[PDB]
Symmetry: D3
């Protein structure tokens, strides 16, 4: 379907709103972010294989590609907005309406039960933390709280097989 | 309060999402929009005065200033998102938290029963309609989707005609 | 008239030039600026009603909305240019030519002859000083001179009633 | 490695130069582009599957992720530049130096040597064609110039329409 | 002086205001504009020289380089602003205070006192006309008035090529 | 020829890639850069005349104007790309094909052996280093390497006549 392709194209324009609201001047798009979540997911999957941890790599990659696709309809609701609206719920509804196909993949990510869902959750957070560091390098002085995501990572069981990359990142 | 001023400053950075998702390259901010909504309200309140219609202009200007201030917290949710989320309810909740003193003014705007509430509603739509035509002059070919249902439009036929004649 | 509305739309596009020349990447428009001047005017008006000071709020909001509308013709000439050009008088004359009712209001702001005019002058400078702080948070190191406006706030009769918000903003 | 992740981040900032040179004012980044190639690759692989065509979906998705990663080092060289400079050859070397393990995947893509490589080449072209249509909707008037296809006749004609 | 180079760097940021007000989304800077005015001045000067005209190429190039430099202080005054403010006068005063050594060259430009001064004026207009055509290719529909701008007996090949756009 | 002029117009839009890849948010164009290189060349030529060093100013300004014009075709290849591609060779070829009459001028620039070639090489590096300082003022923390080009100037004989400006630049 061309409509689905045009729908994913909205992620090239929809900004990542956390950065924007902080006054980061040319904030990345949701497509920008999702691209690197996929790349990170690929790298972390290979690291998990090295450690003998069984990962369905194909599944993890699909989840990374689709995980923020609901934002093509909902937009990237910032934390401030999430006090008053249920972001994942509206994303899930909108995903169900255009790609029911991938409804179970979003739930995996969203519920973060499966190793594959947790991995993408970790890739998601790593993209964001690393991106905060890069925006500080270009001048942002107000992104310290985007590092509170590391404490969240350790919450996930799979994080115990990724202590070396989590440390590489701490070392920023 | 500097914090409230900072809050209002977020409107300088929050984009108007309709234009952005359509592909308008440097879409206006919510402050840009709210500015001209206040200007249009002032202008139309004077044309109403001439026609012998009574308008509390102070109230109408206050309403225009605050009408999208909730979007500093909520952002400017596009129509696509409004299928899944209640825009106006979320803005009302947010405003009640930070600016409870402007809770009634936002309710006037949303209900659009008073002349002042309806005026700002009309001003809101005119800014958008006129902005679509302006972005079309600079290349947008996909804004065709961007008033008579409001009682007050009968006092404002001339400006509505001028807009339509664009 | 739709021409006046089109004229006001120009403030959405016209940059605030002092930021731009300093290297602030995506500086606010004159409309962004005037929007928050109106907001600040409304806050301070209410603050002055508390203190029992009589302000015509309608008039003060009108002045805030129109105070930079002549820049739609003149543009926002920076300090450097104001050494060679009479900006306030060029604006008054431009405004006279498009809406003579708006010339009187501009003059209240410009010459600070009324309490309402003074209030907008202060709101105008508070927007700017706070905006410099915000642009500092996102990387700007060369904006210290935009705090020199704080001293100018004290020159007006109205500032005797705003010794608080002044201190709030000095603290920054 | 954080270096690789930093390297891939450069794609969020490196512009798709074809559009930029045509005068498109806020051109997509290489990441933006690669995101939608990955999405299109997925969608099309599932259409191939519906038809009973064998395809390693995992491999195709990996290739889509990495297929423009060399551009994080080389940048996205426009056509005008490719008359003087060998873009694929430069991207292949750059990639080898950072991700030697994906050298053969890149080769499958760049020389369209497998069904998976072909699929990503197709998704890659479809993103650019559809993006040119999108930039025409927002104002561009100068974008007209912008085997496994036997299984993809439906989507190819949806695009033509 | 580093202050002079910082002064010239302001032109990389100061936008060409006519396009901006028209709604052209990422308008060229004054430096972008001056760069191509200098390039066109070089082309035009070499065309005159080949056709047998006595032309000081070095001078015309210096003039092209400095001709909008007063806009580092004054900014790029649009037509609307010029009904109320004297632009060239303001530019001349500002140049006088920072680059007094280029006052006489700016005068050649501003008053078209020399052939080299005139040539830069011609390059200046050509840049603008051709840039309107470029911004129309990318979507602008409201730039017709910027084609109104269209020795020239030695420049008829180029002026006809521009007309043909 | 309108084609030549359209070609030079490409420099208005082509970014200086070094900045962009660093995260500088609205980086200068090649034309922005090339403008100030021409400016600095003029300025330095005049400083050299005061020190008794004759320069062919006409030639030096032509060189400054054409020196990055091949980037209209090739783009501004960053250092990362230069490890795999011959930038200078590809620009010379592109120039030869469009402006064969300025081939020797771009040779002088690229070799930087003649007085005029050295002069424009100095101006080019000075524009870059000073631009790096300007971008740091607006928030970049990751541009220190660009100052290493100061070291490359001493290797050009003519810089012994330009010690006062080179010291001002170091003083930033
Ligand atoms: Ni995400
Ligand atoms: Ni509104
Ligand atoms: Ni103001
Ligand atoms: Ni590609
Ligand atoms: Ni000029
Ligand atoms: Ni250069």
């Amino acid at each position: 379907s061309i409509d689905l392709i045009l729908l994913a194209g909205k992620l090239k324009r929809i900004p990542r709103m956390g950065w924007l609201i902080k006054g980061v001047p040319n904030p990345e798009s949701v497509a920008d972010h999702s691209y690197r979540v996929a790349f990170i997911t690929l790298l972390l999957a290979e690291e998990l294989k090295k450690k003998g941890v069984e990962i369905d790599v194909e599944k993890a990659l699909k989840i990374a590609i689709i995980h923020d696709l609901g934002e093509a309809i909902i937009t990237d609701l910032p934390l401030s907005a999430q006090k008053y609206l249920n972001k994942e719920e509206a994303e899930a509804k909108a995903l169900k309406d255009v790609l029911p196909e991938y409804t179970e993949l979003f739930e995996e990510y969203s519920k973060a039960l499966t190793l594959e869902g947790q991995l993408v959750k970790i890739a998601d957070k790593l993209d964001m933390i690393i991106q905060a560091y890069e925006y500080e390098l270009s001048g942002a002085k107000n992104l310290s709280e985007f590092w509170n995501a590391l404490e969240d990572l350790e919450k996930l069981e799979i994080s115990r097989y990724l202590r070396e990359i989590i440390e590489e990142v701490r070392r920023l």
